[PDB]
A paper describes a structure:
To elucidate the structural basis for these differential interactions, we solved crystal structures of WUS-HD bound to TAAT, G-Box and TGAA repeat probes to resolutions of 2.8, 2.7 and 1.6 Å, respectively. Intriguingly, the TGAA repeat probe was bound by WUS-HD with much higher affinity (Kd = 0.27 ± 0.03 µM; ± indicates standard deviation, n = 3) than the other two sequences. Interestingly, in the case of G-Box and TAAT, one of the two protein–DNA complexes in the asymmetric unit contained an additional bound HD, whereas both TGAA structures only included two HDs per DNA. In contrast, the two HD molecules interacting with the TAAT and the TGAA repeat probes were on opposite sides of the DNA and formed specific protein-protein modifications between each other. One of the WUS-HD molecules bound to the TGAA probe made additional DNA contacts through stabilization of the helix α3 C-terminus by the other WUS molecule, which might explain the higher affinity for the TGAA sequence. In particular, R96 and R100 of the recognition helix established new contacts to the DNA-backbone, not observed in any of the other WUS–DNA complexes. Notably, in the case of the TGAA homodimer, which showed the highest binding affinity, the HDs associate non-symmetrically via the C-terminal end of the recognition helix (α3), thereby establishing additional contacts with the DNA. In contrast, in the TGAA structure A93 contacted the thymine from the complementary strand, which base paired with the adenine of the +1 position. Interestingly, the affinity of an ideal 2xTGAA DNA repeat was similar to that of the naturally occurring TGAA repeat probe from the CLV1 locus (Kd = 0.27 ± 0.03 µM; ± indicates standard deviation, n = 3), suggesting the binding of two WUS-HD molecules per DNA as seen in our TGAA crystal structure.
Author numbering:
A (entry chain B): 37 to 95
B (entry chain A): 34 to 102
Write the structure that this text describes.
DNA sequence: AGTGTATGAATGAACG
DNA sequence: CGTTCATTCATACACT
């Protein structure tokens, strides 16, 4: 059953994408972002990797 | 229908994963690709480059997942 | 409460 | 090789 980002996670992901211009996070960034988002729910690095890859592809 | 993207079949994926996990093939040589392609060709149209990419992607994504997880 | 949509997940192909 | 791009499948949820 797939990951569904919370309100606070989506807000943080969009801030990283738009305010900090992170389009294709490095492996280092993915670990750090996942740890930050894990405060709000169960999440793994692949969820963050796909979120940015999908968001970039459909922007 | 106009895409030339190879569509692996369930049996082809089954054999590829056997080769990857049982036989420890990670970056098959040109001759290994020749033999693997000829075997998989019994189940669908497939070319050596399809096999080359499958192993390259499988190896890279195994490492990539360990990396960012 | 059936359906359409947004988007999570996957992967073949290819680039740097 | 790690990374990026392109399509396509899968489905959680909102709508009417
Ligand atoms: Mg409505």
């Amino acid at each position: 059953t797939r990951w569904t980002p919370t309100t606070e996670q989506i807000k943080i992901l969009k801030e990283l994408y738009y305010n900090n211009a992170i389009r294709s996070p490095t492996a280092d960034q993915i670990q750090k972002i996942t740890a930050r988002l894990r405060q709000f729910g169960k999440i793994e690095g692949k969820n963050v990797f796909y979120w940015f890859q999908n968001h970039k592809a459909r922007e």
